[PDB]
């Protein structure tokens, strides 16, 4: 399996990419100031050539953060460049969706 | 068993949400000016309370658009409000990602 670590120290663990492009994996968040660190969270998404999307549900056996992240990005020159959006359960405005950029490199 | 149509007339068909919150279904794009109209594309994502992510691979046996869209949003007052990001195979810049807002009502 295929591990990718971003600038914050978080790691995407890719367990499979189906011939359909269906991606399955887990994620360990290590980003300072966020909840749900150091423990595995499930990943689903798509790979289409060098394009990728993947999303993480922030609940597991031990810690919940009432939120989901979706990454949209692309593989080029040894890195996956992504834009992410994080939505909190019970939100009432797109104003409350949090966003940023993660760069992932092989680890 | 759960269909949602946006302001552009596109429809998200949620076929199942697992107890894990894993979403599966298909999507029929009817958004003027885009490719991959009128035929079902596959959906994966997560539901967490009122929070939802889903992502469509724009590949099927009928037409392919070499792209992926990821939606991030929430259910509120009977509609799903979403921000989306569309990435194209072979992209080299975050500048080439396209973004928008979709609002879905039950259909
Ligand atoms: O705090 C939460 O609501 C759960 C953890 C969120 C981690 C975010 S997801 C986008 C960014 N990328 C990371 O590697 N960590 C943060
Ligand atoms: O044109 C492509 O690259 C394939 C289809 C993209 C359709 C987009 S996804 C975001 C927006 N919401 C829709 O209902 N359709 C467009
Ligand atoms: Na790949």
Structure determination technique employed: X-ray
Tokens of B80: 């799903």
Q: Which ligand is nearest to the CA of A76?
A: 3
| A25 to chain B, closest Cα gap in Å | 13
Interface test with B, best of A25, A41, A42, A68 (most B CBs within 10 A): A68
Secondary-structure breakdown of chain A: helix, strand, coil percentages, each rounded to the nearest 5: 5, 65, 35
Distance B28 CA to ligand 3 centre (A): 26
What is the four-CA torsion angle of A20, B62, B44, B99, rounded to 10 degrees?
120
DSSP β-ladder status, B11-17 and B22-28: antiparallel
Distance between CA atoms of residues B97 and B93, nearest Å: 8
Interface list for chain A against chain B, based on CB atoms closer than 8 Å: 20-22, 42, 44-46, 48-53, 55-59, 66-74, 76, 81, 83, 85-92, 94, 97, 101
Nearest to A85 among B81, B83, B88 (CB): B83
Question: Is residue A12 classed exposed, middle or buried when 0-12, 13-18 and 19+ CB atoms within 10 A define those classes?
Answer: buried
Helix (H) or strand (E) holding A102: strand A98-106
Resolution (A): 1.7
- Of A14, A43, A6, A51, the residue nearest B86 (C-alpha): A51
Question: Helix, strand or coil for residue A107?
Answer: coil
> Measuring CA to CA, how many Å separate B101 from each of B6, B69, B73, B98, B107?
10, 12, 9, 11, 19
Dihedral pair phi/psi, residue A80, rounded to 5°:
-100, 110
> Measuring CA to CA, how many Å separate B73 from each of A84, B63, B104?
12, 27, 10
Where residue B92 falls (left for φ over 0; alpha for ψ -120 to 50; beta otherwise) is alpha
């Amino acid at each position: 399996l295929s591990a990718w670590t971003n600038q914050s120290g978080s790691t995407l663990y890719i367990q499979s990419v189906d011939p359909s492009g269906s991606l399955s994996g887990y994620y360990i968040n290590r980003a300072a100031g966020y909840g749900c660190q150091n423990t595995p969270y499930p990943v689903t998404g798509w790979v289409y050539g060098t394009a990728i999307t993947f999303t993480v549900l922030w609940e597991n056996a031990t810690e919940s953060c009432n939120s989901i992240t979706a990454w949209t990005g692309f593989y080029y020159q040894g890195q996956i460049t992504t834009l992410w959006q994080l939505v909190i359960n019970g939100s009432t405005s797109t104003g409350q969706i949090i966003s940023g950029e993660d760069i992932f490199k092989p680890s």
